Coordinates of N, CA, C and O in Angstrom, one line a residue:
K1 N 29.4 94.4 145.7 CA 30.2 92.7 145.0 C 30.0 92.7 146.4 O 29.8 93.1 147.6
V2 N 29.6 91.1 146.5 CA 29.5 90.1 148.0 C 30.7 89.4 147.6 O 31.7 88.7 147.5
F3 N 31.7 90.4 148.8 CA 32.7 89.3 149.3 C 32.8 87.7 150.0 O 31.9 87.5 150.4
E4 N 33.5 87.5 149.5 CA 34.0 85.7 150.3 C 34.8 86.1 151.1 O 35.7 87.1 151.5
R5 N 34.0 85.5 152.4 CA 35.1 85.7 153.7 C 36.7 86.0 153.6 O 36.8 86.9 154.2
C6 N 37.8 85.0 153.5 CA 38.6 85.6 153.8 C 39.0 86.7 152.9 O 40.1 87.6 153.5
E7 N 39.1 86.7 151.5 CA 38.9 88.1 150.9 C 39.0 89.1 151.5 O 39.6 90.2 151.3
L8 N 37.3 88.8 152.1 CA 37.2 90.3 153.0 C 38.2 90.8 154.8 O 38.7 91.9 154.2
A9 N 38.8 89.7 154.5 CA 39.7 89.7 156.2 C 40.9 89.8 155.7 O 41.4 91.1 155.9
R10 N 41.4 89.7 154.1 CA 42.2 90.0 153.8 C 42.4 91.6 153.2 O 43.2 92.5 153.9
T11 N 41.6 92.1 152.6 CA 41.6 93.4 152.6 C 41.1 94.3 153.6 O 42.1 95.3 153.8
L12 N 40.0 94.0 154.6 CA 40.0 94.6 155.9 C 41.2 95.2 156.8 O 42.0 96.2 156.9
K13 N 42.6 93.9 156.8 CA 43.5 93.5 157.5 C 44.4 95.1 156.3 O 45.4 95.9 157.0
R14 N 44.8 95.0 155.2 CA 45.1 95.7 154.3 C 45.0 97.8 154.9 O 45.5 97.9 155.2
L15 N 43.7 98.0 154.6 CA 43.4 98.8 155.2 C 43.3 99.3 156.8 O 42.6 100.5 156.9
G16 N 44.1 98.6 157.8 CA 44.7 98.9 158.9 C 43.3 98.8 159.5 O 43.0 99.5 161.0
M17 N 42.4 97.5 159.4 CA 41.2 97.5 160.8 C 41.4 96.8 161.5 O 41.0 96.8 162.6
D18 N 42.5 96.0 161.8 CA 43.0 94.4 163.0 C 43.8 95.9 164.1 O 44.6 96.3 164.3
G19 N 42.5 95.6 165.1 CA 43.4 96.2 166.5 C 42.9 98.3 166.3 O 42.9 98.8 167.6
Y20 N 42.1 98.3 165.2 CA 41.8 99.6 165.0 C 41.0 100.3 166.4 O 40.2 99.7 166.8
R21 N 41.6 101.2 167.8 CA 40.9 100.6 168.2 C 40.4 100.3 169.4 O 39.2 99.8 170.2
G22 N 41.2 99.2 169.4 CA 41.7 97.8 169.9 C 40.4 97.1 169.5 O 39.8 96.4 170.1
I23 N 40.0 96.9 168.8 CA 38.6 95.9 167.8 C 40.0 94.9 166.9 O 40.4 95.4 165.4
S24 N 39.7 93.7 167.3 CA 40.3 92.9 166.7 C 39.6 92.8 165.0 O 38.0 92.8 164.7
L25 N 40.0 92.2 163.8 CA 39.3 91.5 162.9 C 38.8 91.1 162.8 O 37.3 91.1 162.0
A26 N 38.4 89.9 163.7 CA 37.2 88.7 163.9 C 35.8 89.5 164.0 O 35.5 89.4 163.6
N27 N 36.4 90.8 164.8 CA 34.8 91.5 165.1 C 34.6 92.5 164.5 O 33.2 92.7 163.8
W28 N 35.3 93.1 163.7 CA 35.1 93.5 162.5 C 34.3 93.0 161.2 O 33.1 93.2 160.7
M29 N 35.0 91.6 161.4 CA 34.1 90.4 160.0 C 32.9 90.1 160.5 O 31.8 89.8 159.8
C30 N 32.6 89.9 161.9 CA 30.9 89.3 162.9 C 30.4 90.7 162.2 O 29.2 90.2 162.3
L31 N 30.6 92.1 162.7 CA 29.9 92.9 161.9 C 29.3 93.2 160.7 O 28.4 93.3 160.5
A32 N 30.5 92.8 159.7 CA 30.1 92.7 158.3 C 28.6 92.0 158.0 O 28.2 91.6 157.1
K33 N 29.0 90.8 158.3 CA 28.5 89.5 158.2 C 27.4 89.6 158.9 O 25.8 89.0 157.8
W34 N 26.9 89.9 159.2 CA 25.6 90.2 160.6 C 24.5 91.6 159.6 O 23.7 91.4 159.9
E35 N 25.5 92.1 159.3 CA 25.0 93.9 158.2 C 24.3 93.4 157.2 O 23.4 93.3 157.1
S36 N 25.8 93.0 156.9 CA 25.3 92.8 155.1 C 25.0 91.3 154.5 O 24.8 91.4 153.6
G37 N 26.2 90.4 155.3 CA 26.1 89.4 154.4 C 27.7 89.8 153.3 O 27.5 88.6 152.1
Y38 N 28.3 90.8 154.5 CA 29.3 90.9 153.5 C 28.9 91.6 152.0 O 29.9 91.2 150.6
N39 N 28.4 92.2 152.1 CA 27.5 92.8 150.5 C 27.6 94.4 151.0 O 26.9 95.0 151.7
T40 N 28.4 94.8 149.7 CA 28.6 96.2 149.8 C 27.8 97.0 148.9 O 27.4 98.3 149.3
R41 N 25.9 96.6 148.4 CA 25.1 96.9 148.0 C 24.3 96.7 148.8 O 22.9 97.8 148.4
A42 N 23.8 96.5 150.1 CA 22.9 96.6 151.1 C 22.4 98.1 151.4 O 23.1 98.5 151.5
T43 N 21.2 98.4 151.3 CA 20.9 99.1 151.5 C 19.8 98.9 153.2 O 19.1 97.5 152.7
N44 N 19.0 99.0 153.6 CA 18.1 99.3 154.5 C 17.5 100.4 155.0 O 17.9 102.1 155.4
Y45 N 15.9 101.0 154.6 CA 15.4 101.9 155.0 C 14.8 102.1 155.9 O 14.2 101.1 155.9
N46 N 14.5 102.9 156.9 CA 13.8 102.8 158.7 C 12.6 103.7 158.0 O 13.1 104.7 158.5
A47 N 11.8 103.3 157.9 CA 10.3 104.1 157.9 C 10.1 104.7 158.7 O 9.6 105.6 158.3
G48 N 10.3 104.1 159.8 CA 9.9 104.9 161.2 C 10.8 106.1 161.3 O 10.5 107.1 161.8
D49 N 12.1 106.4 161.1 CA 13.1 107.5 160.9 C 13.5 108.8 159.8 O 14.0 109.5 160.7
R50 N 12.8 107.8 158.9 CA 13.8 108.3 157.1 C 14.9 108.3 157.2 O 15.2 108.6 156.6
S51 N 15.6 107.1 157.6 CA 17.2 107.6 157.4 C 17.4 106.1 156.6 O 16.3 104.8 156.8
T52 N 18.2 106.1 156.4 CA 18.7 105.0 155.3 C 19.9 103.9 155.9 O 21.1 105.1 156.4
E53 N 20.1 102.7 156.3 CA 21.8 102.5 156.4 C 22.3 101.6 154.7 O 21.6 101.3 154.3
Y54 N 23.9 102.1 154.7 CA 24.3 101.6 153.8 C 25.4 101.0 153.5 O 26.3 101.0 154.7
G55 N 25.9 100.2 152.5 CA 26.9 99.2 152.3 C 27.0 98.0 153.4 O 26.1 97.7 154.3
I56 N 28.4 97.4 153.2 CA 28.5 96.7 153.9 C 28.7 96.5 155.5 O 28.8 95.7 156.2
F57 N 28.8 97.5 155.7 CA 28.6 97.9 157.2 C 27.8 98.2 157.9 O 27.1 99.2 158.8
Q58 N 26.4 98.7 157.3 CA 25.3 99.1 157.0 C 24.9 100.7 157.9 O 25.2 101.3 159.0
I59 N 25.7 101.9 157.3 CA 26.3 103.2 158.3 C 24.8 104.0 157.5 O 25.1 104.0 156.5
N60 N 24.3 104.5 158.7 CA 23.5 105.2 158.7 C 23.1 106.8 158.8 O 24.7 107.0 158.4
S61 N 22.5 107.3 157.2 CA 22.4 108.9 157.0 C 22.0 109.5 157.9 O 22.2 110.8 157.7
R62 N 21.6 109.2 159.1 CA 21.4 110.3 159.7 C 22.9 110.7 160.7 O 22.9 112.4 160.4
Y63 N 23.4 109.8 161.0 CA 24.7 110.4 161.3 C 26.0 110.8 161.0 O 27.0 111.6 161.1
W64 N 26.3 109.5 159.9 CA 27.7 109.5 159.1 C 27.4 109.9 157.4 O 28.4 110.3 157.3
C65 N 27.1 109.5 157.1 CA 27.2 110.3 155.3 C 25.2 111.0 155.5 O 24.7 111.2 156.2
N66 N 25.9 111.3 153.8 CA 24.6 112.2 153.9 C 23.7 112.1 152.3 O 24.8 111.5 151.6
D67 N 23.0 111.3 152.6 CA 21.8 111.4 151.1 C 21.1 112.4 150.8 O 20.2 112.1 150.3
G68 N 21.1 113.6 151.4 CA 20.4 114.6 151.1 C 18.8 114.4 151.5 O 17.8 115.5 152.0
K69 N 18.0 113.3 151.5 CA 17.0 112.9 152.4 C 16.8 112.6 153.4 O 15.4 112.2 153.9
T70 N 17.2 112.6 154.6 CA 17.4 112.0 155.7 C 17.0 113.2 156.5 O 18.5 114.6 157.0
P71 N 15.9 113.9 157.5 CA 15.7 115.0 158.2 C 17.4 115.0 159.6 O 17.4 113.8 160.2
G72 N 17.8 115.5 159.9 CA 18.5 115.6 161.2 C 19.9 115.2 160.7 O 21.2 114.9 161.7
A73 N 20.4 115.1 159.1 CA 22.3 114.4 159.0 C 22.7 115.1 159.3 O 22.8 116.1 158.9
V74 N 24.0 114.6 160.4 CA 24.8 115.1 160.4 C 25.7 115.1 159.5 O 27.0 116.1 159.7
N75 N 26.6 113.8 158.6 CA 27.7 114.0 157.6 C 28.6 113.9 158.4 O 29.6 114.5 157.9
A76 N 28.9 113.5 159.9 CA 30.2 112.8 159.9 C 31.5 112.4 159.4 O 32.2 113.1 160.1
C77 N 31.1 111.4 158.4 CA 32.0 111.2 157.6 C 32.4 112.0 156.6 O 33.7 112.0 156.0
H78 N 31.5 113.3 156.3 CA 32.1 114.3 155.7 C 31.5 113.3 154.1 O 32.4 113.5 153.1
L79 N 31.1 112.5 153.8 CA 31.4 111.5 152.3 C 29.6 111.3 151.5 O 28.4 111.1 152.8
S80 N 29.0 110.9 150.6 CA 27.7 111.1 150.1 C 27.8 110.1 150.5 O 28.4 108.5 150.5
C81 N 26.6 108.8 150.9 CA 26.0 107.7 151.1 C 26.5 106.9 150.1 O 26.5 105.5 150.0
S82 N 26.2 107.6 148.4 CA 26.7 106.8 147.6 C 27.8 106.3 147.3 O 28.3 105.2 146.8
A83 N 29.2 106.8 148.5 CA 30.9 106.4 148.1 C 30.7 104.9 148.9 O 31.6 104.0 148.7
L84 N 29.6 104.2 149.7 CA 29.5 103.8 150.9 C 28.9 102.4 150.0 O 28.6 101.6 150.5
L85 N 28.4 102.1 148.3 CA 27.6 101.4 147.8 C 28.9 100.9 146.8 O 28.3 100.1 146.0
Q86 N 29.8 101.4 147.1 CA 31.2 101.3 145.8 C 31.9 99.6 146.3 O 31.3 99.0 147.4
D87 N 32.1 99.4 145.3 CA 32.5 98.0 145.2 C 34.2 97.7 146.2 O 34.7 97.0 146.8
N88 N 34.8 99.4 145.9 CA 35.9 99.7 146.1 C 35.4 99.8 148.0 O 34.6 100.7 148.6
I89 N 35.7 99.1 149.4 CA 35.3 99.6 150.5 C 36.3 101.1 151.6 O 36.2 101.1 152.2
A90 N 37.0 101.5 150.8 CA 38.0 102.1 150.8 C 37.7 102.8 152.0 O 37.7 103.2 153.4
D91 N 36.3 103.8 151.2 CA 35.6 104.6 152.0 C 34.3 104.4 153.0 O 34.8 105.3 154.5
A92 N 34.4 102.9 152.2 CA 33.3 102.9 153.9 C 34.4 102.5 155.2 O 34.1 102.6 156.1
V93 N 35.1 101.6 154.5 CA 36.1 101.0 156.1 C 36.9 102.7 156.8 O 37.2 103.3 157.6
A94 N 36.8 104.0 155.9 CA 37.2 105.2 156.4 C 36.2 105.6 157.2 O 36.7 106.3 158.1
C95 N 35.5 105.5 157.0 CA 33.7 105.9 157.7 C 33.5 105.0 159.0 O 33.0 105.7 159.9
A96 N 33.8 103.8 159.1 CA 33.5 103.0 159.9 C 34.9 103.2 161.2 O 34.9 103.2 162.4
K97 N 36.1 103.5 160.5 CA 37.0 103.9 161.5 C 36.5 105.0 162.4 O 36.5 105.2 163.4
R98 N 35.7 106.6 161.3 CA 34.8 107.6 161.9 C 34.0 107.2 163.6 O 34.1 107.4 164.2
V99 N 33.0 106.0 163.0 CA 32.3 105.7 164.5 C 32.7 105.4 165.2 O 32.3 105.8 166.6
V100 N 33.4 104.6 165.7 CA 34.2 103.5 166.7 C 35.4 105.2 167.3 O 36.0 104.1 168.3
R101 N 35.4 106.1 166.7 CA 36.0 106.8 167.6 C 35.4 107.6 168.6 O 35.9 108.5 169.5
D102 N 34.1 107.7 168.3 CA 33.3 107.8 169.4 C 33.5 107.2 170.8 O 33.4 105.7 170.1
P103 N 32.8 107.5 171.5 CA 33.0 106.7 172.7 C 32.6 105.3 172.9 O 32.8 103.6 173.5
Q104 N 31.9 104.6 172.3 CA 30.4 103.7 172.2 C 31.3 102.6 171.6 O 31.3 101.9 171.2
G105 N 32.5 103.1 170.2 CA 32.8 101.9 169.8 C 32.1 101.8 168.9 O 30.8 102.0 169.0
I106 N 32.6 100.1 168.8 CA 32.0 99.5 168.2 C 30.7 98.5 168.7 O 29.6 98.2 167.6
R107 N 30.3 99.9 169.8 CA 28.5 99.3 170.2 C 27.8 99.9 170.0 O 26.5 99.8 169.5
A108 N 28.3 100.8 168.7 CA 27.4 101.7 167.9 C 26.2 101.0 167.0 O 25.4 101.6 166.8
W109 N 26.6 99.6 167.0 CA 25.8 99.1 166.0 C 25.3 98.1 166.6 O 25.9 96.8 167.3
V110 N 24.2 97.7 167.2 CA 23.3 97.4 167.4 C 23.5 95.8 167.6 O 23.4 94.6 168.2
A111 N 23.6 95.3 166.0 CA 24.1 94.0 165.3 C 24.9 93.4 166.3 O 24.8 92.2 166.1
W112 N 26.4 94.0 166.2 CA 27.4 93.7 166.9 C 26.8 92.9 168.0 O 27.4 92.1 168.6
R113 N 26.3 93.7 169.4 CA 25.9 93.1 170.6 C 25.1 92.1 170.0 O 25.3 90.8 171.6
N114 N 24.2 91.8 169.6 CA 23.4 90.7 169.6 C 23.6 89.6 169.3 O 23.8 88.8 169.9
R115 N 24.7 90.0 168.4 CA 25.2 88.8 167.6 C 26.9 88.2 167.8 O 27.3 87.5 167.3
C116 N 27.4 89.2 168.2 CA 29.3 89.3 168.2 C 29.4 89.0 169.9 O 30.7 88.8 169.9
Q117 N 29.3 90.4 170.4 CA 29.7 90.5 172.1 C 29.1 89.0 172.8 O 28.6 88.5 172.3
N118 N 30.2 89.1 173.4 CA 30.4 87.9 174.0 C 30.7 86.3 173.2 O 30.5 85.5 174.5
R119 N 30.8 86.6 172.4 CA 31.0 85.0 171.7 C 32.4 84.8 171.0 O 33.0 85.9 171.2
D120 N 32.0 83.7 171.0 CA 33.7 83.2 170.4 C 34.0 83.9 168.9 O 32.7 83.7 168.0
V121 N 34.6 84.8 168.2 CA 34.0 85.3 166.7 C 35.4 84.8 166.5 O 35.3 85.1 164.8
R122 N 36.1 84.1 167.0 CA 37.6 83.5 166.1 C 37.1 82.8 164.5 O 38.2 82.9 163.9
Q123 N 35.7 82.0 164.2 CA 35.4 81.7 163.5 C 35.3 82.4 162.0 O 35.7 81.8 161.2
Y124 N 35.7 83.8 162.3 CA 35.1 84.1 161.5 C 36.5 84.6 160.6 O 36.2 85.2 159.1
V125 N 37.5 84.6 161.5 CA 38.8 84.9 159.9 C 40.1 83.9 160.4 O 40.6 84.0 159.6
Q126 N 39.1 82.2 160.3 CA 39.7 80.9 161.0 C 40.0 80.9 159.1 O 39.0 80.4 158.3
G127 N 40.8 80.8 159.1 CA 41.8 79.7 158.0 C 42.4 81.2 156.9 O 42.5 81.0 155.8
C128 N 42.2 82.7 157.2 CA 42.1 83.3 156.2 C 43.8 83.9 155.3 O 43.8 84.6 154.8
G129 N 44.8 83.4 156.9 CA 45.8 83.4 156.4 C 46.4 85.4 157.4 O 47.1 85.7 156.6
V130 N 45.6 85.4 158.4 CA 45.3 87.0 159.1 C 45.9 86.5 160.0 O 45.5 87.8 160.5

């Protein structure tokens, strides 16, 4: 599903993402934006190391979800990577909360450092009533 900006802001808010581990909703929105353009069906295969990134947060198959074909997969979210391509993002949010309980937090996604860190990210939630 491709979410509309404020539709996604209110969904994340309902799912308990605002302020989760010190992370504002705006920061999670900036991350979904640049990772998938708010598209749950997004996949990016990385030929170099044989892993694939899945869904709205581009969660990788080496560490977080299991897809059967990635060498050295850990599957820390204990989730099939298939669960991250649903239109319902409850599973994707549960696994994104798992990622940020590690010390690196949101810095785990390089796209957040490039595109969101030390920038004004208030635009992403502006007018959504969140």
